[PDB]
């Protein structure tokens, strides 16, 4: 439920005896956590609302030159001066023009000309600041367990549908607990302050569109700007980067403005994350959490139930959910009520030996009516297998062939881990970690490598990384010396970081 | 007498859009409004499943169409060399004053 | 060439003008334009392979004014375009030029 | 229970065709019948005289 169709579903198995398991909840990826005697709980980060943002220096992109004026001075008669030069809402530039007897002057030479124009911004973009004490991570928890009606509407996040519950994560209250009816309660230990480093991120608001703009990029835009806390007519410091003073032949100095820079600033957001806004709060479409799953109060619902008798019905002919797992729907035709479904994966049907492990642990028929539905998930081994979902003689089966190999899934998990390391970095060592002296020393040397990598290069694009990586690959392919490993590991750590997009 | 050349658009506006989906390994997505040249289009792959209406899990086919509409465009004109009209002012030195 | 953009003109070189990545029609249209190459202003971005967004970029007037680095500008007083630059090559036959 | 995929054509036909030229250094040629997807077209350069 709610994580069975998304292609970025990861399986986090293996705990420290079932106490806690450190996981990273990505924004688009889904996390499936399976246990020994506890039901499988699917986690997915949905929204990230940032509330009560204060504003920072808000730039202008489309200006408008108002009623201008100009005044000239004769050469060796002083310099030019206007009454509207000392105003801060007027732009001004002095120049030296040719002045002669034909222009009314009486001394040939280089004169002095000042053209003044009133700067009037039409449409400005507003950059806001995001505080780390304002993040509200919503977490939708949904166990696999005893699935109801195959798939229910996921908008019922209320007190009904007790297999699902919502979790709101604040840094003011970083621990939370979702009461699952019958299943106990899962405890969360999220660390939202160690998230997507929001002290160096801003929030741009430009023409009913929003972004996640980096701070060092935002403090370096050559555009007119002001303080931020004024909605009226601002002061507009640095006006000279939008108007252009052009004198044709030192006779007439017409100041013309540049165009609307909205297209020039949409092209300058080469790495921003587009966010949305559902009111006063800005919902992000990205990020990653850092959650430890305290599972001591997570107990398995329906262990005391008996098995089923007979008369299953095979509706919704199953398929592979892009990972080797087979999501199977069944319809138990029987009024026994709370019975336990005998599902196992078995080659050599005379023996019925369980060869493939089961994802939805302890499947439970819930409804006590005639036709009670159920939705399971099984992981067959590579090769041929049968989905035997009954007992006795009235059982129904289904042949399934999971194409692939064990080393193919090993290479797929290695590629997935390499992409997870390139996306997250230091947090990638605690995605399936159980704690110890092996998932913390590697995380420590990766934190040292991240401090020696993110601070070293730190400003390269997609193309420039491959451009210096070809140079480092040439330095590793030649130049026979002792320092030959420093130019090959820094090739792979750049190309994997900027190739797996 | 300048002749016009290719005229670019610099300010656009997206009209009413739509996006057709397709079940995986059940064909490809196709819009009935894809047969007009004023509709831009792009094909992509999305995830489909039992919650999304299909009975086959896998990468589906999504085609999104959007009607393109340019409000303000710029126009390039060409220059014929046989139509230049240079104006040359001459001025001899003689009985003239500074106000001439 | 001779650009025309919101009562402004420029002397734009041909090899710069035929390499602009912007949607254009052929200039010979006097109605609704065909707009060849519309994929340079709209941006198709799938969110999480479950929802595909389509958004246009901003008005490219500032991005094309900043791209006209070395183009001289010109005026236009109607159907004729007066230039603010150029150079001639004139031979001054001073045979009939007598002293008054 | 077979669902269709991309279906190809093997016997085509050409309806009433059209062609039009533009003068050199006078722009590129264009038709109003190019604005439909049921028309194929190709731009080329031919000699043009008085």
């Amino acid at each position, epitope marked *: 439920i709610r994580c069975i169709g998304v292609s970025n579903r990861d399986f986090v198995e293996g705990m420290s005896g079932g106490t806690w398991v450190d996981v990273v909840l990505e924004h688009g990826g889904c996390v499936t956590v399976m246990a020994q005697d506890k039901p499988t709980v699917d986690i997915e980060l949905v929204t990230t609302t940032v509330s009560n943002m204060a504003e920072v220096r808000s730039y202008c992109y489309e200006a408008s030159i108002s009623d201008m004026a100009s005044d000239s001075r004769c050469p060796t008669q002083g310099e030019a001066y206007l009454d509207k030069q000392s105003d801060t809402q007027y732009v001004c530039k002095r120049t030296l023009v040719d002045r002669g007897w034909g222009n009314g002057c009486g001394l040939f030479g280089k004169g002095s000309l000042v053209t003044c124009a009133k700067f009037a911004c039409s449409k400005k973009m507003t950059g806001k600041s995001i505080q780390p004490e304002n993040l509200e991570y919503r977490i939708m928890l949904s166990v696999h367990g005893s699935q109801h*009606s*195959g*798939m*229910i*509407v*996921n*908008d019922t996040g209320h007190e009904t549908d007790e297999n699902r519950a919502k979790v709101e994560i604040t840094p003011n209250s970083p621990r939370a607990e979702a009461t699952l009816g019958g299943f106990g309660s899962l405890g969360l230990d999220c660390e939202p302050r160690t998230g997507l480093d929001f002290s160096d991120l801003y929030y741009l608001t430009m023409n009913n569109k929003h972004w996640l703009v980096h701070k060092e990029w935002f403090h370096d835009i050559p555009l007119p700007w002001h303080a931020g806390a004024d909605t009226g007519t601002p002061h507009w410091n640095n006006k000279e980067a939008l108007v252009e003073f052009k004198d044709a032949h030192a006779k007439r100095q017409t100041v013309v403005v540049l165009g609307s820079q909205e297209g020039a600033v949409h092209t300058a957001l080469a790495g921003a994350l587009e966010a949305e806004m*559902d009111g006063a709060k800005g919902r992000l479409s990205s990020g990653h959490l850092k959650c430890r799953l305290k599972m001591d109060k997570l107990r398995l619902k329906g262990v005391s139930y008996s098995l089923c008798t007979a008369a299953f019905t095979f*509706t*919704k*002919i199953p398929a592979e959910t892009l990972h080797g797992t087979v999501t199977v729907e069944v*319809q138990y035709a029987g009024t026994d009520g709370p019975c336990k479904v005998p599902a196992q994966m078995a080659v050599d049907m005379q023996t019925l030996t369980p060869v493939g492990r089961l994802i939805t642990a302890n499947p439970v028929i819930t409804e006590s*009516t*005639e*036709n009670s*539905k159920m939705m399971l998930e099984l992981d067959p081994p590579f090769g041929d297998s049968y989905i035997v979902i009954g007992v006795g003689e009235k059982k129904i089966t289904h042949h399934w062939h999971r194409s692939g190999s064990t080393i193919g899934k090993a290479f797929e998990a290695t590629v997935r881990g390499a992409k997870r390391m390139a996306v997250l970095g230091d947090t990638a060592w605690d995605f399936g970690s159980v704690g110890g002296a092996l998932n913390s020393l590697g995380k420590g040397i990766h934190q040292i490598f991240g401090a020696a990598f993110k601070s070293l290069f730190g400003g390269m694009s997609w193309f420039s990384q491959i451009l210096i990586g070809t140079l480092l690959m040439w330095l590793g392919l030649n130049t026979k010396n002792g320092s030959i490993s420093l130019m090959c590991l820094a090739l792979g750590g750049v190309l994997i970081f900027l190739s797996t997009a | 007498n300048m002749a016009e050349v290719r005229s670019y658009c610099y300010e656009a506006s*997206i009209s*009413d*859009m*739509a*996006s*057709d*989906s*397709r*079940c995986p390994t*059940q064909g490809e*997505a196709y819009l*009935d*409004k894809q047969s007009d040249t004023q509709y831009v289009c792009k094909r992509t792959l999305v995830d489909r499943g039992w*919650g*999304n*209406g*299909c*009975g086959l899990f896998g990468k589906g086919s999504l085609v*999104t169409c*959007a009607k393109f509409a340019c409000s303000k465009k710029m126009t390039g004109k060409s220059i014929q060399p046989e139509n230049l009209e240079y104006r040359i002012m001459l001025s001899v030195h003689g009985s003239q004053h500074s106000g001439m | 060439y001779y650009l025309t953009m919101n009562n402004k003109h420029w002397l734009v070189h041909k090899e710069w003008f035929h390499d602009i990545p912007l949607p254009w029609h052929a200039g010979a249209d006097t109605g609704t334009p065909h707009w060849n190459n519309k994929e340079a202003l709209v941006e198709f971005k799938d969110a999480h392979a*479950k*929802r595909q*967004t*389509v958004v246009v970029l901003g008005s490219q007037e500032g991005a094309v004014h900043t791209a006209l680095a070395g183009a001289l500008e010109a005026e236009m007083d109607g159907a004729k375009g007066r230039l603010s630059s150029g150079h001639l090559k004139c031979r001054l036959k001073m045979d009939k030029l007598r002293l008054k | *229970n*077979m*669902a269709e995929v991309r279906s190809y054509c093997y016997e085509a036909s050409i309806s009433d065709m059209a062609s039009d030229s533009r003068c050199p250094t006078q722009g590129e040629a264009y038709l109003d019948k190019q604005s439909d997807t049921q028309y194929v077209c190709k731009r080329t350069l031919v000699d043009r005289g008085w």
Partner: antibody
């Protein structure tokens, strides 16, 4: 509870344009996809058009394509079915169907309105 | 091109017996069907989600089955306050979903 009130009643003259305004309130309609189902007198039900959760996307049926465009205000949770180019085949009872959609157009539990008497008379 | 056809459209039966209504399809719609319940003069409700599970407040006396492209209703006991017009709905691939035709239920008189 389930309260999908409809408005924009009266008659539609041939040649004009009106708006069927469904006053949807009582749920979070920023995620609920909205649909429009007719009810022909003497015949069955007809599917007309629908709006996805995302604002830009909106589909119609092939018999009514390019005529009836809808608009959703996220600050109002309302609909506006623009009844442009109404012919004599639109004499039916329009409804408003709202269901939750993880994808573009889907619903697991459906809601319904009360209907709108829309007939064509000249 | 998927037209939901209903066969039969009317059954002159008594309240208390069974009733089987089937909706057909042309292409390969696997299971995503939805039945409806429409009284004349009232707002239409549903009957079953995916032809197996009803809505909130609908008893388990009415159910359906899946057989290829045909989906037959299974009604245990017919009540006199339940005879109305029923419809089908498509929820496969991309919309517009195709409705059926309308199945009324008549009684002897």
């Amino acid at each position: 509870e389930v309260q999908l009130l409809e408005s924009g009643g009266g008659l539609v003259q041939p040649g004009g344009s009106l708006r069927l305004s469904c006053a949807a309130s009582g749920f979070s309609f920023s995620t609920y996809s909205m649909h429009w189902v007719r009810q022909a007198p003497g015949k069955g039900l007809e599917w007309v058009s629908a709006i996805s959760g995302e604002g830009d996307s909106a589909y119609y049926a092939d018999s009514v394509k390019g005529r009836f465009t809808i608009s959703r205000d996220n600050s109002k949770n309302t609909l506006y079915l623009q009844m442009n180019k109404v012919r004599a085949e639109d004499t039916a009872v329009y409804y408003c169907v709202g269901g939750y959609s993880n994808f573009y157009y889907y619903y697991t539990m459906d809601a319904w309105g009360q209907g709108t008497m829309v007939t064509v008379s000249s | 091109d998927i037209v939901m056809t209903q066969s039969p459209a009317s059954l002159s039966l008594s309240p208390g017996e069974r009733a089987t209504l089937s909706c057909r399809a042309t292409q390969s719609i696997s299971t995503f069907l939805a039945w409806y319940q429409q009284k004349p003069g009232q707002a239409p409700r549903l009957l079953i989600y995916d032809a197996s599970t009803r809505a909130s407040g609908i008893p388990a006396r009415f159910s359906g089955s899946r057989s290829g492209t045909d989906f037959t209703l299974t009604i245990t006991r017919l009540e006199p306050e339940d005879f109305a017009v029923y419809y089908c709905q498509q929820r496969y691939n991309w919309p517009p979903y195709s409705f059926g035709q309308g199945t009324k239920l008549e009684i002897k008189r």
